Design an enzyme around this catalytic site. Structure first.
Site, PDB file in Angstrom:
ATOM      1  N   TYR B 148      58.213  44.202  26.245  1.00  0.00           N
ATOM      2  CA  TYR B 148      56.952  44.226  25.510  1.00  0.00           C
ATOM      3  C   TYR B 148      57.113  44.215  23.985  1.00  0.00           C
ATOM      4  CZ  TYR B 148      54.593  44.957  30.029  1.00  0.00           C
ATOM      5  OH  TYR B 148      54.105  44.788  31.309  1.00  0.00           O
ATOM      6  N   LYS B 215      65.630  50.188  37.500  1.00  0.00           N
ATOM      7  CA  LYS B 215      66.243  49.166  38.336  1.00  0.00           C
ATOM      8  C   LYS B 215      67.664  48.970  37.804  1.00  0.00           C
ATOM      9  CE  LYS B 215      66.289  46.830  41.866  1.00  0.00           C
ATOM     10  NZ  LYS B 215      65.572  45.614  42.316  1.00  0.00           N
ATOM     11  N   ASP B 266      62.071  49.559  43.058  1.00  0.00           N
ATOM     12  CA  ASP B 266      61.572  49.029  44.319  1.00  0.00           C
ATOM     13  C   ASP B 266      61.278  50.133  45.323  1.00  0.00           C
ATOM     14  OD1 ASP B 266      64.339  49.503  45.461  1.00  0.00           O
ATOM     15  OD2 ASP B 266      64.781  47.843  44.085  1.00  0.00           O
ATOM     16  N   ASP B 290      54.263  50.466  33.209  1.00  0.00           N
ATOM     17  CA  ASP B 290      53.032  49.693  33.261  1.00  0.00           C
ATOM     18  C   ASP B 290      52.637  49.437  34.714  1.00  0.00           C
ATOM     19  OD1 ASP B 290      50.841  48.140  32.534  1.00  0.00           O
ATOM     20  OD2 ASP B 290      52.028  46.331  32.156  1.00  0.00           O
TER      21      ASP B 290
END
Lengths: 401, 401
Positions: B148, B215, B266, B290
């Site tokens: 971002y 992740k 995940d 987000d």
């Protein structure tokens, strides 16, 4: 030789992404580790019954077992023997059980760039959702692009330093030194490939909508490009087959046409939970597809009952969405539903929808009728069936529908 | 001066990113566009009652309205007037209604790097989940780092060409020309400050667990580094306040200590749906934060009833998680719960927990008693209360508890 090829079968062919399946197709299978043997052989039996029930003797899968994993290590001291690889490159279609990477190797050698994740409500099964009835979607995840390419460097590496110096001088980009750096790449070609596969599947299986999942509002040139390229190839190559959402609420007719729209990633993680029925086919880049697949699968109960696949322009690998479960290996307790669902998906890709529908139907009836394995029985307070017995129940059911 | 500052109030102070609140703190407020005026004034009325009921006249918020958005355009022909900026830099704490950007500008000028998203079950509301009861979490999202930051370039830009040439010759990385390029940056410093905020909040508000969302298994040097840096500052600066999950299942006791663990992204998109009760505080980088916020909020169904905030070491902006709803503007129909919830969050950050608890209990009771606005009444078959009336009901309830 390690393998005896069925002299009665023929390899499946491909012309331009389309599977040209002979009536007696040679299909490979890998038992897998742990519970692999029990669930895969059960799957094969169930699949053979659906094919015979649906097509009689006019069609018959000529299965060829190949070795990989522990079985391969114990037999020939190689977890991925050369002959196994040769059979894979030759027949290119395999139903494979869980393995303890062989999975990545198969995907790379057959260039199975698309990860397919169908998630559909299964009557009788408990769901964390109050209303899972209309969950019927399929995720088409591009599986070779995005941040998963692995182009990244530690914050204290010489590589990162070179990147920072380059960005500052050449691009006038300000970036502190205590930063880890990853390169997110989005390929037009890779995006078009998966998009084509998704639309072609919609046409062939009468699916009505394809939704592009992206964060194009902030990641303008990667995911925003994914969105643009997806619409671009759809309108240029499948014009009279699809209709964009910007056309429906504009005047254009969507009668007998596939609706192609797009949604912002953040909105989708919300809607999948609140109103999952809005989605049919979901088209998304590598990372987003990874996360949306996890959320979608959780909408139903027991993700171990789902199947999936990796597809390329000329081949496919089908597997259950679960591990080896070494704890239940050889105990005839494991739930074979997942690998059976991989077989159902395989049947659909082959164009053998009738056989696939029989499996889907028999499972719904078995689960609604409380004829299930322990993983489910433990919750619906009933005696559980063994792996073999459960597969046989599905078989007797298909014999009456 | 455009703004007549309360001569009776004192500004809130900051010490090591810890709020030092006077008994008569000056707090700024921006009505907002559309329904803004109606809901923000209702929130102020409910907040004052909560403060009065909990502390009598010993404490009182000295509210000071500042202009932004369409009201500012009309009154002083500037969407974000200089006078408003001056008050913000001086008082640094503001409750702001929705605005049709000003939001980004306030966050930057006050360096509000943390996006806070509390989401807990509310007795009586429709939920997509069969069991939403134990949902009680707070998402702490680093909101200035990650992809971002906007360091990206189009596939056919000369910038992208420069990058691909660089990677090829200096890093020996192979990349096609038809690629959009984004750079994911992860800062050690940015990660540490968000981690300190999260743990300090847990300590302050008797929270028992902080889970790092990442992740790192595939994005080792960005998200994997986020995880490593978080554990580091926690173990190094809050040793006698926390205990890791690894330490617990290693022999160490967790009695009287905050638990710190981590989960792969995940896995969290799955578990947030099947068993959200497992999470307390979720610590996450910008992108994950987000997406997880969207999924978490969807668990209660009424997103418009949630509040949130952006916090910095010396300031805070509190707002509802919904838009201006122009169609409802000035009709005394809008649900003020979201902005009130933002006010509840502001009170917690201020350390005025008694007043915050009053607001929380009153809302629960009001909903449980079916005294609600039309967005909720529609589903429980009861006559809806207007915006003013619903706020007044919360006020009469607080006078009872």
């Amino acid at each position: 030789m390690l393998y005896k090829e069925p002299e009665d079968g023929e390899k499946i062919k491909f012309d331009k992404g389309k599977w040209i399946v002979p009536n007696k197709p040679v299909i490979l299978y890998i038992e897998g580790d742990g519970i692999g043997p029990e669930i895969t052989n059960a799957a094969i039996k169930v699949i053979n019954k659906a094919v015979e029930r649906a097509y009689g003797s006019s069609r018959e899968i000529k299965w060829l077992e190949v070795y990989a994993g522990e079985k391969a290590e114990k037999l020939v001291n190689d977890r991925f023997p050369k002959e196994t690889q040769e059979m894979l490159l030759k027949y290119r279609v395999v139903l494979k059980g869980p393995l303890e990477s062989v999975n990545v190797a198969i995907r790379l050698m057959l260039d199975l760039y698309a990860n397919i994740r169908p998630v559909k409500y299964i009557e009788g099964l408990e769901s964390p959702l109050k209303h899972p009835e209309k969950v019927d979607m399929i995720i088409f995840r591009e599986n070779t692009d995005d941040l998963y390419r692995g182009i990244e460097y530690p914050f204290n590496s010489e590589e990162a330093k070179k990147i920072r110096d380059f960005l500052r001088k050449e691009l006038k980009v300000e970036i502190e030194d205590d930063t880890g750096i990853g390169i997110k790449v989005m390929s037009k070609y890779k995006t078009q490939r998966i998009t084509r596969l998704a639309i072609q599947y919609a046409i062939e299986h009468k699916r009505k909508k394809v939704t592009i999942m992206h964060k194009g509002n902030v990641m303008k040139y990667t995911e925003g490009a994914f969105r643009e390229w997806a619409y671009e190839v759809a309108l240029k190559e499948y014009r009279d087959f699809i209709v964009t959402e910007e056309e429906i609420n504009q005047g254009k007719p969507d009668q007998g046409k596939i609706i192609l729209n797009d949604r912002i990633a953040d909105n989708m993680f919300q809607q999948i939970i609140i109103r999952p029925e809005e989605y049919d086919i979901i088209l998304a880049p590598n990372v987003n597809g990874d996360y949306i697949s996890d959320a979608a699968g959780a909408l139903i109960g027991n993700i171990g009952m789902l199947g999936g696949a990796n597809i390329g322009d000329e081949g496919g690998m089908f597997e259950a969405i679960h591990g080896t479960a070494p704890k239940y290996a050889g105990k005839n307790v494991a739930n074979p539903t997942g690998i059976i669902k991989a077989g159902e998906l395989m049947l659909r890709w082959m164009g053998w929808n009738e056989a696939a529908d029989l499996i889907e139907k028999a499972i719904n009836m078995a689960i609604r009728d409380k004829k299930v394995t322990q993983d489910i029985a433990r919750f619906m307070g009933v005696k559980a069936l063994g792996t073999k017995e459960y597969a046989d129940e599905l078989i007797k059911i298909m014999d009456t529908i």
